Protein backbone atom coordinates (compact mmCIF):
# COMPACT_ATOMS: atom_id res chain seq x y z
CA UNK A 1 0.00 0.00 0.00
CA UNK A 2 0.75 3.72 0.28
CA UNK A 3 3.28 4.76 2.99
CA UNK A 4 1.18 5.42 6.07
CA UNK A 5 2.03 5.79 9.74
CA UNK A 6 2.38 2.63 11.86
CA UNK A 7 2.72 3.09 15.63
CA UNK A 8 4.33 0.29 17.65
CA UNK A 9 4.01 0.33 21.46
CA UNK A 10 5.79 -1.98 23.88
CA UNK A 11 7.32 -2.07 27.36
CA UNK A 12 10.95 -2.17 28.56
CA UNK A 13 10.61 -5.68 30.07
CA UNK A 14 13.09 -7.95 28.34
CA UNK A 15 10.77 -10.55 26.89
CA UNK A 16 8.77 -7.89 25.04
CA UNK A 17 11.42 -6.22 22.86
CA UNK A 18 13.39 -8.80 20.86
CA UNK A 19 10.43 -10.77 19.38
CA UNK A 20 9.28 -7.92 17.11
CA UNK A 21 12.48 -6.05 16.16
CA UNK A 22 12.75 -7.77 12.78
CA UNK A 23 9.05 -7.15 12.15
CA UNK A 24 9.49 -3.41 12.79
CA UNK A 25 12.65 -3.37 10.66
CA UNK A 26 10.72 -5.00 7.81
CA UNK A 27 7.88 -2.47 8.05
CA UNK A 28 10.43 0.35 7.93
CA UNK A 29 12.16 -1.29 4.97
CA UNK A 30 8.82 -1.35 3.12
CA UNK A 31 8.77 2.46 3.14
CA UNK A 32 6.33 3.05 6.00
CA UNK A 33 6.69 5.67 8.71
CA UNK A 34 6.99 3.63 11.91
CA UNK A 35 6.97 5.22 15.36
CA UNK A 36 7.88 3.08 18.37
CA UNK A 37 6.70 4.12 21.83
CA UNK A 38 8.72 2.65 24.68
CA UNK A 39 10.66 3.58 27.80
CA UNK A 40 13.96 5.40 27.08
CA UNK A 41 15.84 2.63 28.90
CA UNK A 42 15.53 0.53 25.72
CA UNK A 43 16.21 3.36 23.29
CA UNK A 44 19.13 1.40 21.84
CA UNK A 45 16.96 -1.53 20.74
CA UNK A 46 14.17 0.76 19.52
CA UNK A 47 16.41 3.04 17.46
CA UNK A 48 18.39 0.13 16.00
CA UNK A 49 15.12 -1.07 14.45
CA UNK A 50 14.96 2.15 12.41
CA UNK A 51 11.65 3.28 13.85
CA UNK A 52 11.09 6.70 15.37
CA UNK A 53 11.47 6.41 19.15
CA UNK A 54 8.53 7.91 21.05
CA UNK A 55 9.66 8.00 24.70
CA UNK A 56 7.31 7.48 27.61
CA UNK A 57 8.03 6.76 31.27
CA UNK A 58 7.30 3.17 32.24
CA UNK A 59 6.13 2.25 35.72
CA UNK A 60 7.35 -1.34 35.28
CA UNK A 61 10.58 -2.02 37.25
CA UNK A 62 6.95 -9.05 45.99
CA UNK A 63 3.30 -10.14 46.14
CA UNK A 64 0.85 -11.39 43.53
CA UNK A 65 -1.78 -8.70 44.16
CA UNK A 66 1.03 -6.13 44.40
CA UNK A 67 2.39 -7.28 41.03
CA UNK A 68 -1.05 -6.69 39.49
CA UNK A 69 -1.12 -3.23 41.08
CA UNK A 70 2.23 -2.39 39.46
CA UNK A 71 0.84 -3.36 36.04
CA UNK A 72 -2.31 -1.31 36.59
CA UNK A 73 -0.11 1.62 37.64
CA UNK A 74 1.79 1.27 34.36
CA UNK A 75 -1.45 1.14 32.36
CA UNK A 76 -2.78 4.25 34.12
CA UNK A 77 0.50 6.07 33.48
CA UNK A 78 0.98 4.89 29.89
CA UNK A 79 -2.33 6.01 28.39
CA UNK A 80 -2.03 9.81 28.96
CA UNK A 81 1.57 9.75 27.72
CA UNK A 82 0.53 7.90 24.57
CA UNK A 83 -2.40 10.29 24.12
CA UNK A 84 -0.14 13.34 24.41
CA UNK A 85 2.45 11.98 21.97
CA UNK A 86 0.00 10.96 19.23
CA UNK A 87 -2.83 13.51 19.64
CA UNK A 88 -1.69 15.62 16.68
CA UNK A 89 0.10 12.78 14.84
CA UNK A 90 -2.40 9.94 14.88
CA UNK A 91 -1.25 6.71 13.22
CA UNK A 92 -3.07 4.57 10.68
CA UNK A 93 -2.75 1.53 12.95
CA UNK A 94 -1.58 0.80 16.49
CA UNK A 95 0.66 -2.24 17.02
CA UNK A 96 1.08 -3.12 20.68
CA UNK A 97 2.80 -5.73 22.82
CA UNK A 98 0.60 -7.70 25.24
CA UNK A 99 1.62 -5.41 28.11
CA UNK A 100 1.03 -2.26 26.00
CA UNK A 101 -2.76 -2.73 25.86
CA UNK A 102 -3.38 0.95 26.82
CA UNK A 103 -2.57 1.55 23.15
CA UNK A 104 -5.74 -0.39 22.30
CA UNK A 105 -7.76 1.87 24.61
CA UNK A 106 -6.29 4.82 22.74
CA UNK A 107 -7.09 3.15 19.41
CA UNK A 108 -10.69 2.61 20.51
CA UNK A 109 -11.01 6.30 21.47
CA UNK A 110 -9.78 7.47 18.05
CA UNK A 111 -11.43 4.84 15.85
CA UNK A 112 -8.05 3.49 14.72
CA UNK A 113 -7.48 -0.26 14.15
CA UNK A 114 -5.15 -2.05 16.56
CA UNK A 115 -3.18 -5.31 16.35
CA UNK A 116 -1.71 -7.11 19.35
CA UNK A 117 1.84 -8.45 19.04
CA UNK A 118 2.13 -11.40 21.44
CA UNK A 119 5.69 -12.59 22.21
CA UNK A 120 4.50 -15.89 23.71
CA UNK A 121 1.43 -18.12 23.60
CA UNK A 122 -1.97 -16.58 24.23
CA UNK A 123 -4.74 -17.60 26.64
CA UNK A 124 -7.81 -18.67 24.66
CA UNK A 125 -11.35 -18.04 25.86
CA UNK A 126 -11.32 -21.50 27.46
CA UNK A 127 -8.03 -21.17 29.29
CA UNK A 128 -9.63 -18.32 31.22
CA UNK A 129 -12.51 -20.46 32.54
CA UNK A 130 -10.04 -22.90 34.10
CA UNK A 131 -8.56 -19.89 35.96
CA UNK A 132 -11.96 -18.61 37.09
CA UNK A 133 -11.58 -20.12 40.62
CA UNK A 134 -8.24 -18.33 41.03
CA UNK A 135 -9.81 -15.03 39.94
CA UNK A 136 -12.83 -15.37 42.24
CA UNK A 137 -10.63 -16.23 45.21
CA UNK A 138 -8.54 -13.13 44.46
CA UNK A 139 -11.73 -11.05 44.54
CA UNK A 140 -12.48 -12.32 48.06
CA UNK A 141 -9.30 -10.63 49.28
CA UNK A 142 -10.01 -6.93 49.95
CA UNK A 143 -6.75 -6.12 48.15
CA UNK A 144 -7.87 -8.14 45.13
CA UNK A 145 -11.39 -6.70 45.12
CA UNK A 146 -9.94 -3.19 45.39
CA UNK A 147 -7.64 -3.91 42.44
CA UNK A 148 -10.41 -5.08 40.11
CA UNK A 149 -12.51 -2.07 41.10
CA UNK A 150 -9.67 0.31 40.20
CA UNK A 151 -9.19 -1.52 36.90
CA UNK A 152 -12.88 -1.16 36.00
CA UNK A 153 -12.79 2.51 37.01
CA UNK A 154 -9.80 3.11 34.73
CA UNK A 155 -11.72 1.59 31.81
CA UNK A 156 -14.75 3.77 32.54
CA UNK A 157 -12.63 6.89 33.06
CA UNK A 158 -10.74 6.15 29.82
CA UNK A 159 -13.88 5.91 27.70
CA UNK A 160 -14.15 2.13 27.29
CA UNK A 161 -16.76 1.04 29.88
CA UNK A 162 -18.32 -1.49 27.48
CA UNK A 163 -15.30 -3.83 27.58
CA UNK A 164 -14.31 -6.24 30.35
CA UNK A 165 -10.88 -5.86 31.92
CA UNK A 166 -10.01 -9.41 30.86
CA UNK A 167 -11.21 -9.08 27.26
CA UNK A 168 -9.21 -5.91 26.91
CA UNK A 169 -5.64 -7.32 27.25
CA UNK A 170 -6.35 -11.01 26.56
CA UNK A 171 -9.08 -10.86 23.86
CA UNK A 172 -7.56 -8.45 21.31
CA UNK A 173 -9.38 -7.41 18.16
CA UNK A 174 -6.51 -8.81 16.08
CA UNK A 175 -3.39 -10.56 17.29
CA UNK A 176 -0.12 -11.72 15.77
CA UNK A 177 1.11 -14.56 17.98
CA UNK A 178 4.87 -14.80 17.47
CA UNK A 179 5.07 -18.54 18.25
CA UNK A 180 4.33 -21.63 16.15
CA UNK A 181 1.05 -23.42 16.79
CA UNK A 182 2.91 -26.40 18.28
CA UNK A 183 4.17 -24.10 21.09
CA UNK A 184 0.65 -22.83 21.89
CA UNK A 185 -1.13 -24.79 24.63
CA UNK A 186 -4.72 -25.69 23.71
CA UNK A 187 -4.36 -24.39 20.16
CA UNK A 188 -7.81 -25.93 19.57
CA UNK A 189 -9.55 -23.24 21.62
CA UNK A 190 -7.74 -20.32 19.95
CA UNK A 191 -9.98 -18.61 17.41
CA UNK A 192 -7.70 -18.10 14.41
CA UNK A 193 -10.12 -15.57 12.97
CA UNK A 194 -8.74 -13.39 15.79
CA UNK A 195 -5.27 -14.83 16.53
CA UNK A 196 -2.70 -15.62 13.82
CA UNK A 197 0.18 -17.97 14.63
CA UNK A 198 3.13 -16.29 12.94
CA UNK A 199 6.07 -18.06 14.50
CA UNK A 200 9.23 -16.08 15.20
CA UNK A 201 10.00 -12.97 13.18
CA UNK A 202 13.56 -13.47 11.95
CA UNK A 203 15.72 -11.28 9.76
CA UNK A 204 19.18 -12.74 9.08
CA UNK A 205 21.86 -13.75 11.57
CA UNK A 206 22.53 -11.24 14.36
CA UNK A 207 26.31 -11.92 14.35
CA UNK A 208 27.56 -10.90 17.84
CA UNK A 209 30.70 -12.99 17.20
CA UNK A 210 31.38 -16.55 16.10
CA UNK A 211 32.05 -19.50 18.41
CA UNK A 212 34.11 -22.49 17.26
CA UNK A 213 33.97 -25.87 18.98
CA UNK A 214 37.27 -26.55 20.80
CA UNK A 215 39.21 -29.28 19.04
CA UNK A 216 39.06 -32.52 21.00
CA UNK A 217 35.50 -31.97 22.30
CA UNK A 218 33.16 -34.46 20.64
CA UNK A 219 29.95 -33.01 22.12
CA UNK A 220 29.04 -29.49 23.25
CA UNK A 221 26.55 -28.50 25.95
CA UNK A 222 25.24 -25.00 26.65
CA UNK A 223 23.74 -24.15 30.05
CA UNK A 224 21.93 -20.80 29.99
CA UNK A 225 19.00 -20.04 32.29
CA UNK A 226 18.31 -16.80 30.48
CA UNK A 227 15.39 -15.51 32.54
CA UNK A 228 17.17 -12.59 34.26
CA UNK A 229 17.14 -14.25 37.72
CA UNK A 230 19.90 -16.78 37.03
CA UNK A 231 20.82 -16.88 40.75
CA UNK A 232 21.56 -20.63 41.02
CA UNK A 233 25.22 -21.28 41.88
CA UNK A 234 24.39 -24.67 43.49
CA UNK A 235 22.88 -25.84 40.19
CA UNK A 236 25.90 -24.43 38.34
CA UNK A 237 28.13 -26.51 40.60
CA UNK A 238 26.08 -29.61 39.75
CA UNK A 239 26.56 -28.81 36.05
CA UNK A 240 30.35 -28.58 36.35
CA UNK A 241 30.27 -31.66 38.59
CA UNK A 242 28.43 -33.49 35.79
CA UNK A 243 30.51 -32.32 32.84
CA UNK A 244 33.69 -32.69 34.86
CA UNK A 245 33.81 -36.52 34.68
CA UNK A 246 32.19 -36.14 31.25
CA UNK A 247 35.24 -35.87 28.97
CA UNK A 248 34.66 -35.63 25.20
CA UNK A 249 31.96 -33.15 26.21
CA UNK A 250 32.62 -29.42 26.45
CA UNK A 251 30.40 -27.34 28.72
CA UNK A 252 29.66 -23.68 28.02
CA UNK A 253 28.18 -22.40 31.27
CA UNK A 254 26.47 -19.00 31.10
CA UNK A 255 25.96 -17.84 34.69
CA UNK A 256 24.48 -14.38 34.11
CA UNK A 257 25.53 -10.79 34.77
CA UNK A 258 24.70 -11.10 38.52
CA UNK A 259 27.39 -13.64 39.46
CA UNK A 260 30.83 -14.94 38.35
CA UNK A 261 31.42 -15.47 42.09
CA UNK A 262 33.13 -18.56 43.51
CA UNK A 263 33.77 -20.70 40.44
CA UNK A 264 36.55 -23.25 40.87
CA UNK A 265 40.37 -23.05 40.88
CA UNK A 266 40.27 -22.07 37.17
CA UNK A 267 37.61 -24.76 36.57
CA UNK A 268 38.02 -28.23 35.07
CA UNK A 269 39.42 -28.13 31.55
CA UNK A 270 35.95 -29.24 30.47
CA UNK A 271 34.12 -26.09 31.59
CA UNK A 272 34.31 -22.55 30.20
CA UNK A 273 32.23 -19.99 32.07
CA UNK A 274 30.78 -16.71 30.82
CA UNK A 275 28.45 -14.04 32.13
CA UNK A 276 26.89 -13.82 28.67
CA UNK A 277 27.47 -15.81 25.49
CA UNK A 278 26.46 -15.42 21.85
CA UNK A 279 23.63 -17.89 22.33
CA UNK A 280 22.82 -18.50 18.66
CA UNK A 281 26.53 -18.99 17.93
CA UNK A 282 26.97 -21.55 20.73
CA UNK A 283 23.75 -23.33 19.74
CA UNK A 284 25.18 -23.66 16.22
CA UNK A 285 27.74 -26.10 17.67
CA UNK A 286 25.67 -27.39 20.61
CA UNK A 287 24.48 -30.95 21.16
CA UNK A 288 22.22 -30.10 24.13
CA UNK A 289 20.81 -26.89 25.60
CA UNK A 290 19.84 -26.43 29.26
CA UNK A 291 17.42 -23.52 29.70
CA UNK A 292 14.63 -22.33 31.99
CA UNK A 293 12.13 -22.83 29.17
CA UNK A 294 11.44 -19.23 28.27
CA UNK A 295 9.89 -18.77 24.85
CA UNK A 296 13.00 -17.03 23.51
CA UNK A 297 15.37 -19.82 24.47
CA UNK A 298 13.03 -22.60 23.33
CA UNK A 299 12.53 -21.06 19.89
CA UNK A 300 16.30 -20.57 19.64
CA UNK A 301 16.80 -24.24 20.50
CA UNK A 302 14.26 -25.29 17.87
CA UNK A 303 15.83 -23.03 15.23
CA UNK A 304 19.26 -24.55 15.89
CA UNK A 305 17.91 -28.11 16.12
CA UNK A 306 19.35 -28.59 19.61
CA UNK A 307 17.54 -30.82 22.15
CA UNK A 308 16.73 -29.17 25.45
CA UNK A 309 16.75 -29.93 29.15
CA UNK A 310 14.10 -27.61 30.58
CA UNK A 311 13.95 -26.34 34.18
CA UNK A 312 10.73 -24.30 34.35
CA UNK A 313 10.29 -21.70 37.07
CA UNK A 314 8.51 -18.48 36.07
CA UNK A 315 4.85 -18.22 35.06
CA UNK A 316 5.39 -18.81 31.31
CA UNK A 317 7.84 -21.72 31.62
CA UNK A 318 5.85 -24.72 32.98
CA UNK A 319 3.59 -24.90 29.92
CA UNK A 320 6.59 -24.33 27.62
CA UNK A 321 8.35 -27.25 29.31
CA UNK A 322 5.29 -29.42 28.72
CA UNK A 323 5.14 -28.49 25.03
CA UNK A 324 8.74 -29.37 24.16
CA UNK A 325 8.53 -32.57 26.22
CA UNK A 326 5.27 -33.42 24.45
CA UNK A 327 7.10 -32.92 21.15
CA UNK A 328 9.62 -35.58 22.21
CA UNK A 329 12.66 -33.29 21.97
CA UNK A 330 13.15 -32.37 25.62
CA UNK A 331 13.45 -33.59 29.20
CA UNK A 332 12.04 -31.72 32.21
CA UNK A 333 13.96 -31.39 35.50
CA UNK A 334 13.60 -29.51 38.78
CA UNK A 335 16.65 -27.46 39.80
CA UNK A 336 15.85 -28.00 43.49
CA UNK A 337 15.74 -31.81 43.31
CA UNK A 338 17.97 -32.61 40.30
CA UNK A 339 20.82 -35.15 40.92
CA UNK A 340 24.21 -35.27 39.11
CA UNK A 341 23.37 -38.65 37.54
CA UNK A 342 19.80 -37.52 36.78
CA UNK A 343 21.02 -34.38 35.01
CA UNK A 344 23.75 -36.35 33.22
CA UNK A 345 21.32 -39.04 32.04
CA UNK A 346 19.08 -36.48 30.33
CA UNK A 347 22.10 -34.82 28.71
CA UNK A 348 23.76 -37.95 27.32
CA UNK A 349 20.53 -39.70 26.28
CA UNK A 350 19.04 -36.64 24.57
CA UNK A 351 22.19 -35.93 22.55
CA UNK A 352 22.60 -39.53 21.31
CA UNK A 353 18.97 -40.37 20.45
CA UNK A 354 18.57 -40.40 16.63
CA UNK A 355 14.77 -40.18 16.87
CA UNK A 356 15.15 -36.95 18.85
CA UNK A 357 17.37 -35.52 16.11
CA UNK A 358 14.84 -36.48 13.43
CA UNK A 359 11.97 -34.81 15.29
CA UNK A 360 14.04 -31.62 15.54
CA UNK A 361 14.49 -31.52 11.76
CA UNK A 362 10.73 -31.87 11.36
CA UNK A 363 10.05 -29.09 13.86
CA UNK A 364 12.49 -26.86 11.97
CA UNK A 365 10.44 -27.32 8.82
CA UNK A 366 7.19 -26.85 10.71
CA UNK A 367 8.61 -23.76 12.41
CA UNK A 368 9.31 -21.70 9.28
CA UNK A 369 5.97 -22.69 7.68
CA UNK A 370 3.99 -20.30 9.92
CA UNK A 371 4.88 -17.30 7.72
CA UNK A 372 7.26 -15.33 9.94
CA UNK A 373 8.21 -11.71 9.31
CA UNK A 374 6.86 -11.39 5.78
CA UNK A 375 3.43 -12.79 6.64
CA UNK A 376 3.18 -10.58 9.74
CA UNK A 377 4.10 -7.48 7.74
CA UNK A 378 1.59 -8.41 5.02
CA UNK A 379 -1.20 -8.79 7.60
CA UNK A 380 -0.38 -5.40 9.13
CA UNK A 381 -0.43 -3.74 5.71
CA UNK A 382 -3.99 -5.04 5.18
CA UNK A 383 -5.01 -2.65 7.97
CA UNK A 384 -3.51 0.37 6.20
CA UNK A 385 -5.76 2.61 4.05
Amino acid sequence: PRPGHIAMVSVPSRGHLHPSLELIRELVARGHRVTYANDPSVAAAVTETGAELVPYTSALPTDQIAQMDVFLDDAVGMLPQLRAAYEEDRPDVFLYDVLAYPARVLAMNWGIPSIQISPTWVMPEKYRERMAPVVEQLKQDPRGAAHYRRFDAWLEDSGVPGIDAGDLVNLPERSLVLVPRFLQPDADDVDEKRFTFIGPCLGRRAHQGDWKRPAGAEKVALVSLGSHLTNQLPFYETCVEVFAALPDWHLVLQIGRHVDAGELGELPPNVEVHNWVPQLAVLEQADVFVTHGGMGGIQEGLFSGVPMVVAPQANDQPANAESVVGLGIARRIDIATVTPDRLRAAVVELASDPAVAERLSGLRRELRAHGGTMRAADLIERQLP
Binding site: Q64, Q67, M123, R128, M131, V134, V135, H147, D316
Partner: peptide, 9 residues
Amino acid sequence: XXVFVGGXX
Protein backbone atom coordinates in the same frame (compact mmCIF):
# COMPACT_ATOMS: atom_id res chain seq x y z
CA UNK B 1 0.41 -12.61 36.53
CA UNK B 2 2.99 -15.09 38.33
CA VAL B 3 1.18 -18.18 36.79
CA PHE B 4 -0.66 -16.67 33.60
CA VAL B 5 -3.96 -15.56 35.55
CA GLY B 6 -5.72 -14.95 32.03
CA GLY B 7 -8.58 -12.92 33.87
CA UNK B 8 -6.07 -9.93 34.58
CA UNK B 9 -2.25 -9.12 35.43
